[PDB]
């Protein structure tokens with residue numbers, strides 16, 4: 001199939017991704033220097049990376065056909081709830097199964113399980129986080145499916161606080177059918193076996209990851225000393 | 241909760 005409108009949706013999302021994801025990770029030099037030596041030594045660096053990533057995820061969302069039609073408040077509710085999920089999702093691009101780490105160019109910007117723990121997280125989040133990256137990496141998604149999955153994650157109707165739930169659903173459904181159809185026409189077997197159902201399952205895994213993220217964030221921000229080390233956007237998006 | 245920054249980035 002792949003109608004005219006669907007080839008457009010994919011072309012748009014591919015470009016929107018391209019305009020918001022620099023595979024050379026050159027801006028990482030603006031972030032506060034990472035410290036891998038009191039723990040939480042990676043909090044300043046990773047706080048900045050995440051802050052940066054939230055900005056890029058937002059720019060991506062604004063290019064999702066249909067997203068601009070949502071109200072101001074619904075756009076806000078969808079971004080606040082999916083931000084950490086799309087960052088985990090989009091980070092799969094730099095993640096490598098070679099050594100289970102996110103490799104962004106240089107040693108300075110190569111993150112692993114210990115850096116994550118030096119940001120305030122335990123295996124509570126890390127174990128399933130790496131499990132997530134591994135299952136996602138194995139699916140060997142086409143970049144088309146990758147951007148479609150991120151957009152579907154952002155435009156989810158069940159996010160609490162949503163108002164125009166039916167409008168959100170209409171936008172997401174349009175994206176799902178574009179993805180379901182792209183897989184059937186563009187993704188060849190075996191890689192396409194259960195591919196869609198596996199992709200949706202990843203969205204559920206992310207709901208679990210978000211949940212853990214939220215609980216530990218409550219404990220971290222529990223002490224202004226650490227909360228003071230974040231950025232203004234991170235505080236606003238995850239909670240102030 | 242009014243999100244000034246998220247608001248401006250979406251605008």
Ligand SMILES: C=C1[C@H](O)CC(=C/C=C2\CCC[C@]3(C)[C@@H]([C@H](C)CC#C[C@@H](O)[C@]45C[C@H]6C[C@H](C[C@H](C6)C4)C5)CC[C@@H]23)C[C@H]1O
Nearest residue numbers: 046047050053087088090091094102111116119213217234
């Ligand atoms: C441009 C890119 C590249 O692919 C590189 C990326 C890699 C992603 C990584 C490696 C570094 C650690 C990352 C951020 C994980 C983070 C630490 C998990 C989390 C979380 C949040 O609770 C939290 C994130 C920041 C630091 C700390 C305080 C607060 C701000 C809340 C923990 C999730 C994805 C991982 C991000 C992506 O946007």
